[PDB]
Amino acid sequence: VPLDGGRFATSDLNDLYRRVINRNNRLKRLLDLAAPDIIVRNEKRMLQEAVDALLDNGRRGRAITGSNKRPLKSLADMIKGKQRQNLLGKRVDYSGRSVITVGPYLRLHQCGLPKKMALELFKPFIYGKLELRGLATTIKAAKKMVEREEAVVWDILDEVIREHPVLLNRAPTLHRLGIQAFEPVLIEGKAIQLHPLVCAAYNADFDGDQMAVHVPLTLEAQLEARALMMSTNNILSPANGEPIIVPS
Amino acid sequence: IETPITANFREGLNVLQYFISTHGARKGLADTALKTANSGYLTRRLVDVAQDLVVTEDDCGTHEGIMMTPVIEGGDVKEPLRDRVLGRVTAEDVLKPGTADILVPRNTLLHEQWCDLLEENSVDAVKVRSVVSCDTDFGVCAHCYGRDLARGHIINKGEAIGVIAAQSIGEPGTQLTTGGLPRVADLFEARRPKEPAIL
Amino acid sequence: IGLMKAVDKFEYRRGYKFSTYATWWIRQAITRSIADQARTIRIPVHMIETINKLNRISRQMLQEMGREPTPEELAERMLMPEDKIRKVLKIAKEPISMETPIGDDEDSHLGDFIEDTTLELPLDSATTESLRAATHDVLAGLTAREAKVLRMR
Amino acid sequence: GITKASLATESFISAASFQETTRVLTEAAVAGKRDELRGLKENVIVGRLIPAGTGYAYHQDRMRRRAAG
Amino acid sequence: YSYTEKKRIRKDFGKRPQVLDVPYLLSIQLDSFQKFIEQDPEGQYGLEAAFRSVFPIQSYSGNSELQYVSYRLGEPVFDVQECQIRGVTYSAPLRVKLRLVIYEREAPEGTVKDIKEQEVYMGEIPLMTDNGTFVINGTERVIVSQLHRSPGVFFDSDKGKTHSSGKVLYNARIIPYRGSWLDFEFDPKDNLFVRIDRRRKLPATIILRALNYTTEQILDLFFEKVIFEIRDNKLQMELVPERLRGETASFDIEANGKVYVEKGRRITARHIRQLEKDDVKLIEVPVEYIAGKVVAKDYIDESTGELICAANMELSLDLLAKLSQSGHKRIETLFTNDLDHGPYISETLRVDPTNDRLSALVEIYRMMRPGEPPTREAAESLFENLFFSEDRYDLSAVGRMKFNRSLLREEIEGSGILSKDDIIDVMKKLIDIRNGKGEVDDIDHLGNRRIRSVGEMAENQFRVGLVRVERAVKERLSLGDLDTLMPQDMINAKPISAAVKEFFGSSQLSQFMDQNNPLSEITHKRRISALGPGGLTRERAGFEVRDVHPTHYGRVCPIETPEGPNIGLINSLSVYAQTNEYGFLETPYRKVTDGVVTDEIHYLSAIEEGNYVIAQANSNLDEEGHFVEDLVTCRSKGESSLFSRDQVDYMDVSTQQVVSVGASLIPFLEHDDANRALMGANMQRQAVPTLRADKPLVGTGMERAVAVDSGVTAVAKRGGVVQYVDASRIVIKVNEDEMYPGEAGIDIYNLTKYTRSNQNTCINQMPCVSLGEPVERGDVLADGPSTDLGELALGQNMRVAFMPWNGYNFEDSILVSERVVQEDRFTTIHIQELACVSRDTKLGPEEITADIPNVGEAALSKLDESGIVYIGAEVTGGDILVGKVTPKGETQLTPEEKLLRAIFGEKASDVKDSSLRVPNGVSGTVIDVQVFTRDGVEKDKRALEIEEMQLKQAKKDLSEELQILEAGLFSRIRAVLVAGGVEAEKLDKLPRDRWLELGLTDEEKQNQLEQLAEQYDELKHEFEKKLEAKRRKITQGDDLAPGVLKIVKVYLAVKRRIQPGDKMAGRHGNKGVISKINPIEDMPYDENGTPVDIVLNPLGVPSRMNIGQILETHLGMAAKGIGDKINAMLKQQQEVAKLREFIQRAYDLGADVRQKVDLSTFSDEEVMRLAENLRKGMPIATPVFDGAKEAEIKELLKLGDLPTSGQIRLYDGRTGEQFERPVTVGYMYMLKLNHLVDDKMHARSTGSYSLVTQQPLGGKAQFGGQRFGEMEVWALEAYGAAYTLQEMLTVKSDDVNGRTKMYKNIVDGNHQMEPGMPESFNVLLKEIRSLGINIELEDE
Ligand SMILES: Cc1noc(C)c1S(=O)(=O)Nc1c(N2CCC(NCc3ccc(C(F)(F)F)cc3)CC2)c(=O)c1=O
Ligand SMILES: [Mg+2]
Ligand SMILES: [Zn+2]
Structure with a gap:
């Protein structure tokens, strides 16, 4: 692939295959030129090496990459993907995050969500909802309305937000309480407001901790967050019958 | 160190007092970091071994179960009997101090009014159904597991008890201290000790 | 292989020593080969000479200038359009490794940041399906003779 | 030991995730193993519902239908 | 008192007097660089020592030689500002004189023609700022000093764990400054081994055999010979009476018609004394005794000319008979004593495969270079270029001195390579320690850990630039031409320039200066690191070296070290601490001759210190210098107890010499728990500089020295009177005395204005002196960011109250009155650089043009004719800053679009909008524009x-x-x-x-x-x-990079107020995120009606035992109190005497302190200035461990008419009613750390996706998505969220089709997902099928 400045970048396979291809053709040629046994064996030996390096560089002398000192990555190494090994884990859409602060007013089942975040998150819901209510002509039309942050969209947003809960996650996810669902209450600010009783499970303070938020798109998922992951359902701990939602 | 920090924090700690205070602190911090890293490595290995373990059967109907008694260490009890039985289903019907009268029938789930009934009576030993005992092939029977949930009822079909089990163990693992988190690691890993005893 | 050819074209009767005659043929097959397979993106022979030549002019002017020559300085030494140098320098680079680890020494590699530009956005994919629906409502509103004729043009 | 216990698995997909991948993969291949799925991780990788929970309802239906009529 | 001091004197507490003051904090950086670049006329480290080392470069016997003359640094191309503005490096070009000499063949050293070639250019070397920074590419950068193992020889153990027997083995390592390592180690069976670097193990006699020592001579070296004689017939033994200690007699040891020890009696200290006095030198022994005694040299039968026995071969009874009938009068055995003189070299010789000098050389070649054929020239040349060639090996003097000191030699300086003796003696030592006498040295100790900084590190890199050029010169002098070429043709500046640039650019020890704070700067420069080249990696060591060592005392700070994964690998340098001449850390001490404490300073090494007995700083002494108590607490050899009056040899310089500068700035430290101290000390650095410099009321006394030494401030060169002040510049009319005879002089100081910092904050200066003021040498002329009138001001003091306010201070969250956000006092300014790049693409060039497609007039109206926004223009998110367009024609549109092009008949563009526009959310004022063409x-x-x-x-x-x-x-x-x-x-x-x-x-x-x-x-x-x-x-x-036609950099200044989500903290390790901004009214208020600025939770004090924060709050109350009293008098305009009396009363409070004061100060013009400066509050200093006591604080509260309690009754602003109990109130210095929520908040609906893995990726302002890991997957698995999991890592990520099919449904109003397969797997399939493996998807 091209880059900026006219620079080019490539996967290390291309280097390796090139070696197979070249040594394979050099040999095809020597068979008709009637080379002496010493050379064809030598070439037959080299071809073995290039192939072995393509598939699993490492079980031999380990060929190093073009100019760069570092050795090239062979097919078998792309099959793993974790150099013990790395945990994770993939990146997801409809998701955000920020610093968390308090929020004593909340009920157990709700959470505080910045106005701005909410907007950018539910964007597609909002777009359809405008043109389903005839405020926007087309989709392109809604695109711009929400860009302008017209007073009418703030009303529409309260609608797509009503019975639609979000999920909130904290740094290490030890037990399943690491992710819990909340009904979103709209907030002016840029801070996520969390219920004080739930802090315990999450192991959250307000010493600068941060949490992420996820939107359950499909319907089944909305319900799965209302019936299983909803803050109110997880009142007791699954490690021992005693309640985790404890006055702090 | 033989001479301890005689002063406190309302008082001032002098130079040699602080300097010595330091090591304890620095070791502490490092120690928590490592104990955080190791608690997760366990859980990872734990979830690996469980994972696929799901509540499949409704009731495998075996009578085989383990025998529950209060822990009782040394002089007096370290953890009482009520806690160990609560929420577990009974393997066979237990009786009062005098027989002929069964207080609780064959496989009844022992809850709060039952435990209070088994505390009203001097009952001290109970045989209970366990996942280790459960016949069920490829899964665990609903009855054998018990109930515990964030819901107060018996466990439902299809819940991945395995994963939830794992999580439960390594999560508070950060708090732990032969012994400590590494001892726990050794137990699960089933390691033979240096000088073993033959029977 | 450059040897394997010196042996066929050899004539001992010319009294030429085989130890130097082949030296030309072996040295010929080696340097011709580097020209074809040493590069990921193959460039022609006249292009490699051009390149090497410029590193010779740069050497001369390196401490000669006190710092280093301007892109349009070497341009003057050279018979060619002299701007071509910019094009030459750009092609002559050779691709950088996609698996080159970037900062924090993390498993984060170069390729992980190359975004896909060929793709079509979802926000866009919708407006198009929507433009289909909108032009239809408009076409059906017209007279049938007019719609069929428009859809043809 | 759990670490050894986790090693035995019917599902070569699930195996390749944590064990040594070359080894798992080599051995499965010679054998001509067939992963029937039925397990948590293996379905996640391949991308279908989990054989537990909500998905439990569906997976139970797919299993009986398999090798039936 | 000095002119700046006279304006505002901080009242100092604490008794102890400062005998030695704080030295120039940035000394280490500025001294280091100086030695590298200095013209030295000897071999001391530097560029001179660099050249002298690799020069001369003579041809392979070609007798054509290139020699070094001298170097020079020409003045830089650009100054520091031009460098930063343009964006290049600040360096001076290196012009060096070289001489090429061609020799005559054949004359004995006769030269043909020599060319003394003019100074050839061999690269530029970047230069250091007055502050110790390097501008690398228009950015200030710092090179962190390294802490590594000192070169020489060191002996270690590795007890117990080695083979689990218990035994403990002993290793010896010979680590030079440059060159290969040489290891000597014991095996379990007591045989000695050696390994060069970390390579294969070999028996230790092989290396001696390689040095030309025969079996006979090696045995001659290590062991003592025991002489046996066969006088008259059958045996006699030469005896030394001491030899028989720790041995039980085997036979009747009788001598001179007398019996001393009978058969089977242990020879003790008694039998040894008796034989010693008697003078017994020969005793008769039996034939059977030498059945195991090993023979030292070879013995041969003269007649046959055959070998009876070889050296180091056990004697047998038949063998004894053979050498005796062949007529041999003496025999040389070994003295093998199991406890005292073990036969370890004797048993190793038996393991040894080799027999002679070549055999050894070959074996060592075969280990070092295995597989390849060993020649004779090779094996000999390889062994010589391992330890004996000045080129490939150099111990350095640091190493040479340490090496000699460990073997206990008389010398302190010798060679750079190993002598035959050096290797032998090292062995001889390692053998003593196994036998007994001898202790192994620990690594952790600071006499064995050396310190390197910038200058030396770079001298090392320039050597590497030379060794590779040396290769080019030799290669050229080979094909040599005569008087045609010159040393200029062959010396290539690029590899020289490349290597130096790499070091300063990409290096572990080089990084961007922490420029968000003047402490951040100064502390960064004083950072130590065990990391980098020649240093261990996080994973390799090893809590033993991380931890606090006793030798750290007064050399490194026990607390300032990171919480992260590299705790104890970093550390910051102690205040009074310096770098030793050889490179060791030495801290200063007071000499105690007999019983009197002198005022003379002695700097001491980690080992020097170990010997003497040192008295605590925390001691009481009066009059001439006598200790008050007979018994004073002292530390002597690693431990500390109570000692005699006339016994101490030394005494600590100060109360603060044990900590670092960042630690010395935490007041009442003594009252904080080390764990929380460490965090505050780290947190202070992250403080962003406020809009108005406050100054702490509660200080420690460093604050000034910190601000001065860091160049953020502007200080007086010479002293005179101010001729002109201006927000722009300051001019001083110098005093005649300080002046220079010629060229008069009036110093002009140009202030740094509203410019960007490395952490995108705002670094700006301000004039603090006003017109016509007399200034002294070394007074602040201007202040810098976060500096008030010379003092360090990282934050601002707030009126604070401790009480729970309905849960708005639940975890650590902080509650703040609008009054703080109104006063704009925690407001902070940020500056951003945003560049538009006009490049050349294959489709054509990019244009920076005002004419852009699909843009309303209103958008374009903010741009000038060219397309570049106007300076002073207030911009918001989305607005175009530089209008750019990228060429892209032949779009190829759809038929529905083609219809639209006939209807509205719009002309289609052959160009794409690539203009730079304000990132979404940010909004500021353009303040500068720079174009680079x-x-x-x-x-x-x-x-x-x-x-x-x-x-x-x-x-x-x-x-x-x-x-x-x-x-x-x-x-x-x-x-x-x-x-x-x-x-x-x-x-x-x-x-x-x-x-x-x-x-x-x-x-x-x-x-x-x-x-x-x-x-x-x-x-x-x-x-x-x-x-x-x-x-x-x-x-x-x-000069621009390839492809780029031109670049437009826009500088944007955004004023950020202070909102919920922002992080705040005090000096005592108290974190906190502001929770809710509240109205003035609702605030808890005291009886006077003055509300509190910030409401704090009291629960964060018992748990996190940082108790000093409370004393800050009480002494802060007392402080402000004194100011209120003065503001009261100031407003009533009492009079000079009335104000004088109270103020003089204030600076005397506390009793026996070191402060001192007037009346000398001029009743008018002077006293009133101070008065005004105090009305904001009275600045007070609490030294670190010489702090102000509870009592002194209570009395200062009494003087301000305030309660001793430090507690006041308060009322809720909401109900007007009183809170039961009194709450603590007072003033605490609070900071704003740059973790602002504005930066932290992120969100994404749909967006861009990566090329290889079709996975969310951010680029066009719009950030990537959040990472949903395995761990979280387990979470959903634990619930029943099967659909939540499916949509999560299918349609919301890798599913290239489903992702759009979803988006399409959502707008259509359908909550349905059509799953399908993720790419992540789909790819695996192709990847393994491209191995020879067939994977298939079975069944229906
Ligand atoms: C998220 C997440 N958290 O846990 C899970 C699991 C997920 S995932 O379902 O999205 N799967 C995911 C990934 N790959 C690629 C690497 C591959 N591991 C070795 C392997 C297994 C099976 C074979 C076979 F047998 F199929 F050939 C070959 C190689 C596993 C699958 C990622 O990366 C990644 O993020
Ligand atoms: Mg926290
Ligand atoms: Zn069961």
Whole structure:
């Protein structure tokens, strides 16, 4: 692939295959030129090496990459993907995050969500909802309305937000309480407001901790967050019958 | 160190007092970091071994179960009997101090009014159904597991008890201290000790 | 292989020593080969000479200038359009490794940041399906003779 | 030991995730193993519902239908 | 008291007097660099030592030699500012003189022609700022000092764990400064081994055999010989009486018609004394005794000419008979004593495969270079270039001295390579320690860990640049031409420039200066690191080296070290601590001759210190210098207890020498728990500089020295009076005494204004002196960011109350009154650099043009004719800053679109909008625009307008300086001509320039005037020589990278207020995120009606035992109290005496303190200035471990009419009613750390996706998505969220089709997902199928 400045970048396979291809053709040629046994064996030996390096560089002398000192990555190494090994884990859409602060007013089942975040998150819901209510002509039309942050969209947003809960996650996810669902209450600010009783499970303070938020798109998922992951359902701990939602 | 920090924090700690205070602190911090890293490595290995373990059967109907008694260490009890039985289903019907009268029938789930009934009576030993005992092939029977949930009822079909089990163990693992988190690691890993005893 | 050819074209009767005659043929097959397979993106022979030549002019002017020559300085030494140098320098680079680890020494590699530009956005994919629906409502509103004729043009 | 216990698995997909991948993969291949799925991780990788929970309802239906009529 | 001091004196507490003050904090950096770049006329480290090492470079016996003369550094191309503005490096070019000599063949050292080639250029080397930073590419950067193992020899153990037997083995390592390692180690069976570097193990006699030692001679080296004689017939033994210690007798040991020890009795200290006094030298022994005794040298039968026995071979009873009948009178055995003199070398010889000198050489070659065929030239040349060649090996003096010191030699300096003796003696030592006598040295100890910094590290890199050029010269002198080439043709500056640039650029020890704070700067420069080259990695070590060592005391700080994964690998340097001449850390001490404490300072190494007994700083001594108590607490050898009066050899310099500068700035430290201290000390650094510099009421006393030494502030060079002040510049009319005879002088100081910092904050200066003020040498002329009148001001003091306020201070969250957000006092300014790049693509070039497609007039209206936004224009998110367009024609549109193009009939664009626009959310004021065009490419309208304004601006500053300088010279002349020829009115009536034409009578005054005239024209000439250069730099085409036609950098200044989500903290490790901003009314208020600024939770104090934060709050209350009393008197306008009395009362409070005060200070003009400066509160200093006691605080509270409690009754602003119990209130210095929520918040609906893995990726302002890991997957698995999991890592990520099919449904109003397969797997399939494996998807 091209880059900026006219620079080019490539996967290390291309280097390796090139070696197979070249040594394979050099040999095809020597068979008709009637080379002496010493050379064809030598070439037959080299071809073995290039192939072995393509598939699993490492079980031999380990060929190093073009100019760069570092050795090239062979097919078998792309099959793993974790150099013990790395945990994770993939990146997801409809998701955000920020610093968390308090929020004593909340009920157990709700959470505080910045106005701005909410907007950018539910964007597609909002777009359809405008043109389903005839405020926007087309989709392109809604695109711009929400860009302008017209007073009418703030009303529409309260609608797509009503019975639609979000999920909130904290740094290490030890037990399943690491992710819990909340009904979103709209907030002016840029801070996520969390219920004080739930802090315990999450192991959250307000010493600068941060949490992420996820939107359950499909319907089944909305319900799965209302019936299983909803803050109110997880009142007791699954490690021992005693309640985790404890006055702090 | 033989001479301890005689002063406190309302008082001032002098130079040699602080300097010595330091090591304890620095070791502490490092120690928590490592104990955080190791608690997760366990859980990872734990979830690996469980994972696929799901509540499949409704009731495998075996009578085989383990025998529950209060822990009782040394002089007096370290953890009482009520806690160990609560929420577990009974393997066979237990009786009062005098027989002929069964207080609780064959496989009844022992809850709060039952435990209070088994505390009203001097009952001290109970045989209970366990996942280790459960016949069920490829899964665990609903009855054998018990109930515990964030819901107060018996466990439902299809819940991945395995994963939830794992999580439960390594999560508070950060708090732990032969012994400590590494001892726990050794137990699960089933390691033979240096000088073993033959029977 | 450059040897394997010196042996066929050899004539001992010319009294030429085989130890130097082949030296030309072996040295010929080696340097011709580097020209074809040493590069990921193959460039022609006249292009490699051009390149090497410029590193010779740069050497001369390196401490000669006190710092280093301007892109349009070497341009003057050279018979060619002299701007071509910019094009030459750009092609002559050779691709950088996609698996080159970037900062924090993390498993984060170069390729992980190359975004896909060929793709079509979802926000866009919708407006198009929507433009289909909108032009239809408009076409059906017209007279049938007019719609069929428009859809043809 | 759990670490050894986790090693035995019917599902070569699930195996390749944590064990040594070359080894798992080599051995499965010679054998001509067939992963029937039925397990948590293996379905996640391949991308279908989990054989537990909500998905439990569906997976139970797919299993009986398999090798039936 | 000095002119800046006189304005605001901070009241100091604490008894102890400072005998030694804080030395120039940034010394380590500035001293280091100096030695590297200094012209030294000896072999001491530096560029000179660098050249001398690799030179001369002589041809392979070709007798053509290139030799080094001398180097030079030409003045830089650009100054520091130009460097940062343009964006290049600040370096001086290296011009070195080289001599090429060609020798005659064949004459004994006769030279043909020699060319003394002029100074050839071999690269530029970047230069250090007065602050110790390097500008690398227009960015200030710091090179962190390294802490590594000192070179030489060190012996270790590795007890117990080695093989689990218990035994403990012993290793010896010979680590040089450059060259291979040589290891000597014991195996379990007591045999000695060796390994070069970490390679294969070999028996230790092989290396001696390689040095030309025969079996006979090696046994001759290590062991003592025991002589056996066969006088008359059958045996006799030469005896030394001491030899028989730790042995039980085997036979009847009788001598001289007397029996000393009977058969089977242990020879003890008694049998040894008796034989010793008697003088017994020969005793008779039996034949059977030498059945195991090993023979030392070979023995042969003379007659046959055959070998009876070889050296190091056990004797048998038949063998004894053989050498005796062959007529051998003596035998040489070994003295093998199991406990004392073990036969370890004797048993190793038996393991040894080799037999001679070559055999050894071959074996060692075969280990080092295995597989390849060993030659003779090779094996010999390899062994010599391992430890004996000056090129490939150098112990360095540091190492040489340490090496000799460990073997206990008389010397301190020797060679750089190992002698035969060096290797032998090292062995001889390692063997003593196994036998007994000898202790192994621990690594952790700071006498074995050495410290390296910038200068030396770079000298090391320049050597590597030379060794590789050495290769080019040798390669060239090979094909040698005669007097045609010159040393210039062959020396290539690029690899030299490349290597130095890499070191300063990409290096672990080089990084961007922590520039968000003046502590951040100063602490960064003083950072130590065990990391990098020649240092361990996080994963390799090893809690033993991380931890606090006793030798750390007063050398490194026990607390300032990171919480992260590298705790204890970093550390910050102790205040008074310096770098030793050989490179060790030494801390200063007071000499105690007999019983009196001198005022003489002695600096001590980690080992010097170990011997002496040192008295605590925390000691009591009076009068001449006598200790008050007979018993004083002292530390001696690693431990500390109570000691005798006349016994101490030394005493600590200060209460603060154990901590670091960042630690010395935490008040009442003593009252904080080390765990929380560490965090605050780290947190102080992350403080962003406020809009208005406050100054702490509660300080410690460093605050000033910290601000001065860091160059954020502007300090006096010479002292005089202020001629002109201006937000722009300050000019000082120098005092005659400090002045220089010629060229008069008036110092002009130019202030740094509203510019960007490395952490995108705002680094700006301000004039603190006003017109016509007398200044002293070393006073602050201007303040810098987060500095108030000379003192360090990272934050601002707040009125604080401790109480739970309905849960708005639940975890650590903080509650703040609007009054703080109104006063704009925690407001902070941020500056951003945003560049638009105009490049060349294959489709054509990119245009920076005002004409952009699909944009409303209103959008374009913010741009100038060229397409570049106007300076001063207030912009918001989305607004176009630089209009750019990228060529892209032949779109190929759809038929529905084609219809639309006929209807509205719009012309389609062959260009794409690539303009730079304000990132979403951010909003500020454009404050500068810089254009950089490629040379040769035509400058646009805006580009030139800027060049013009600059030239004008350049000519103005230049001329104005010259103008002030002219008057300064001419004023000096008027005073010189009047002192001997006064014409006070007669003089100024003629033109000022025609004065130079007047002479004077016979004096040096005639010479002084001559000097001023001379300096007058050098100024005239320099002004013109500068204006030329400045003009050139403005006009000249900035060199741009490939592809790029031109670049537009816009600088945006955003004013960020303070909101919920922002992080705040105090100096005592108390974190906190502001929770809710509240109305003024609702605030808890006291009886006077004055509300609290910030409400804090009291629960964060018992748990996190940082108790000093409370004392901050009480002493802060007392502090502000004194100010209120003064503000009261100031408002009533009492009088000079009334204010004097109270103030003098205040600076005396506490009893027996070191403060001191007036009356000397001038009743008027002076006292009133101080008064006004105190009305905001009275600044107080609490030394670190010499702090102010509870009592002193309570009395200062009494003096402000405040309660001793420190507690007041308060009322809720909401209900008006009283809170039961009194709550603590007072003032606490609080910071704003740059973790602002504005930066932290992120969100994404749909967006961009990566090329390989079709996975969310951010680029076009719009950030990537959040990472949903395995861990979280388990979470959903634990619930029943099967659909939540499916949509999560299918449609919301890798599913290239489903992802859009979803988005389409959502807008259509359908909550359905159509799953399908993720790419992540789909790819795996192709990847393994491209191995020979077939994977398939089975069944229906
Ligand atoms: C998220 C997440 N958290 O846990 C899970 C699991 C997920 S995932 O379902 O999205 N799967 C995911 C990934 N790959 C790629 C690497 C591959 N591991 C080795 C392997 C297994 C099976 C074979 C076979 F047998 F199929 F050939 C070959 C190689 C596993 C699958 C990622 O990366 C990644 O993020
Ligand atoms: Mg926290
Ligand atoms: Zn069961």
